[PDB]
Structure formats: C-alpha cells, structure tokens
Amino acid sequence: SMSVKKPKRDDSKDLALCSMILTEMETHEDAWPFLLPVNLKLVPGYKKVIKKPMDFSTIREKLSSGQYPNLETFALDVRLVFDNCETFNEDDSDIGRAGHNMRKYFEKKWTDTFK
Numbered sequence: 029s030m031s032v033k034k035p036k037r038d039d040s041k042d043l044a045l046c047s048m049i050l051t052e053m054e055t056h057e058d059a060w061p062f063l064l065p066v067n068l069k070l071v072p073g074y075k076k077v078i079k080k081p082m083d084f085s086t087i088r089e090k091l092s093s094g095q096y097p098n099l100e101t102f103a104l105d106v107r108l109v110f111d112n113c114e115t116f117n118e119d120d121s122d123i124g125r126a127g128h129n130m131r132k133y134f135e136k137k138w139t140d141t142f143k
Contacts, residue, residue, distance in 0.1 A: 042099040049137050054084055058126040062109050082108040106134055
C-alpha cells in the first residue's frame, strides 16, 4: 500500500529474456502455423470467429517496439496464439498438434526462465 512495498524483483533482463524465448519458439520445427498472421481474406471463418488474432511475427514487432509493459502481457499474447489455435483447429490435425506441442514448449521455458 502507500509507502509499503514488497522487495524489488529485478526485471531489468526481462526484455532480453522474452526475446530469447520468442527466438526459440520462432525456430521450433512446429512453429510454421504461427510465424505469420492468419490471412483473413483467404481463411473463411477466421475473421468472425477469432476476435483477437495473434502470431509470432506480431509478438516480435510488439516486443521490439516497447508495446509490452511487463513480462506477463508478453505471456498473455503467446498463450493467445495457442488459444486461438485450439479454438479453430481440431486436436487431431497437424496444426492442432502443433499448437499443443508449442504451448508445452513455451510453458517449460517460461517456468525455467522466470519461476
């Protein structure tokens, strides 16, 4: 509360460390469904159904331009990419499986880097 603060967690490396995670997600062999925004002209149903599209290239641009206020807003966008994927793709599809695999990969890196 006023003039009463928990000890200051060092967040000075968060930007660099989120960048490194995002690099590792970008280079994973199963990243291909997530590298670029879904083409809303060419994928029937996506625009109406998926209210907040997100992809790795959009996260990279947001990260690089100071549009993440903190490491949690960064994780929220990464998770959004996988939540969108689960919303639109059957679990038993190449893209559906890709999304599960990447979410697992992310969550481990996240825990190991920050928890």
